[PDB]
From a paper:
I-PpoI is a well-characterized intron-encoded homing endonuclease member of the physarum polycephalum slimemold. Surrounded by two beta sheets and an alpha helix, the His-Me nucleases active sites all contain a single metal ion, a histidine, and an asparagine. The asparagine residue helps to stabilize metal ion binding whereas the strictly conserved histidine is suggested to deprotonate a nearby water for nucleophilic attack toward the scissile phosphate.
To confirm if a monovalent metal ion binds in the pre-reaction state, we soaked the I-PpoI crystals in buffer containing Tl+ and detected anomalous electron density at the metal ion-binding site without product formation. In addition, only one Tl+ was detected by its anomalous signal in the pre-reaction state. The biochemical and structural results indicate that additional monovalent metal ion may not be necessary for DNA hydrolysis.
Author numbering:
A (entry chain A): 2 to 163
B (entry chain B): 202 to 363
The structure:
DNA sequence: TTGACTCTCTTAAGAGAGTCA
DNA sequence: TTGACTCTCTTAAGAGAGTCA
């Protein structure tokens, strides 16, 4: 098992490497009709990605470090949270992009929460539109809005009441 | 099946059978500290479920009818929408429970929308809490709230900015 | 020890189709 | 014809692990 010092060193080498990713400025909706700016540190689209990083899926990467001849590997966005509890309320903790930008590995753009909380940020009105998340959103969710419903509630007869 | 008249006959037969399901009253949060009341028509927990209905999964059912001697089968919640486009913006249309009650088959609790719109209703603040869905929600989403984030955005060094 | 690939799995909102009687 | 079971698949937010040099 890695000591807490070894984990800290893993987190430090991860931050060192990610800090050299290309930094892209994105203008984003905050809610309430406001505009804000996020700076994402984006993993490259193709190899090489950076020391310790490899792509295991179209938008999935892993970080790998070998310590005392033992290979350790983590999901690439989970590394900032290696000193945190890994579950809550019986649910696994997941890396959650506050910037909604999968390639971004900026730890200031990530939080550590259940998959349901993670997903729900897709529909949040944003920090200036009424977000109620205790760890506040950085932007309005990309899927927030009136939606595109094709057909609403309806019946042909009179068998039903709401 | 194929013709419009045949499709109307399927919707009417479905409504007649579901109109005989047990009607269960559920009191629900509306948002804004308000409460409302919904009447769900709930498919039975075990066989028999009703004429034409069979369970294909723990919370999945199908409706089956024999038309021109050929069996036609649909997901049990899709029948009200058989005359609607089955996609929108290149996304499949799905039956979306406004009451968030899978066993309910009340078509006044169903709409027809992309899977993303469907999912997002889980986190909607509700019709009295700021819902912006064009086809309005019937209740606050069961997952709306501050969340239970274990760790927020953080860095150990000074390589990152928001 | 390291890079660049390969594969399958989880979750919770949803689906389609076959085997018997 | 109808009922009651079986099985796997889709999506988009997320994961773990093997092989080879
Ligand atoms: Tl997310
Ligand atoms: Tl739903
Ligand atoms: Zn970012
Ligand atoms: Zn939020
Ligand atoms: Zn209902
Ligand atoms: Zn809504």
């Amino acid at each position: 098992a890695l000591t807490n010092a070894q984990i800290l060193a893993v987190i430090d080498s991860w931050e060192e490497t990610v800090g050299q990713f290309p930094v892209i400025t994105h203008h984003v909706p905050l809610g309430g009709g406001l505009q804000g700016t996020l700076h994402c540190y984006e993993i490259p689209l193709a190899a090489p990605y950076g020391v310790g990083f490899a792509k295991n899926g179209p938008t999935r990467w892993q970080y790998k470090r070998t310590i005392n001849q033992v290979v350790h590997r983590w999901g690439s966005h989970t590394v900032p949270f290696l000193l945190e509890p890994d579950n809550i309320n019986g649910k696994t903790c997941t890396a959650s992009h506050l910037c909604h930008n999968t390639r971004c590995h900026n730890p200031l753009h990530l939080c550590w929460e259940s998959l349901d909380d993670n997903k729900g940020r897709n529909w949040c009105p944003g920090p200036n539109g009424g977000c109620v998340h205790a760890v506040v959103c950085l932007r309005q969710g990309p899927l927030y809005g009136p939606g595109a419903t094709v057909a609403g509630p309806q019946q042909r007869g009179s068998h039903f009441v709401v």
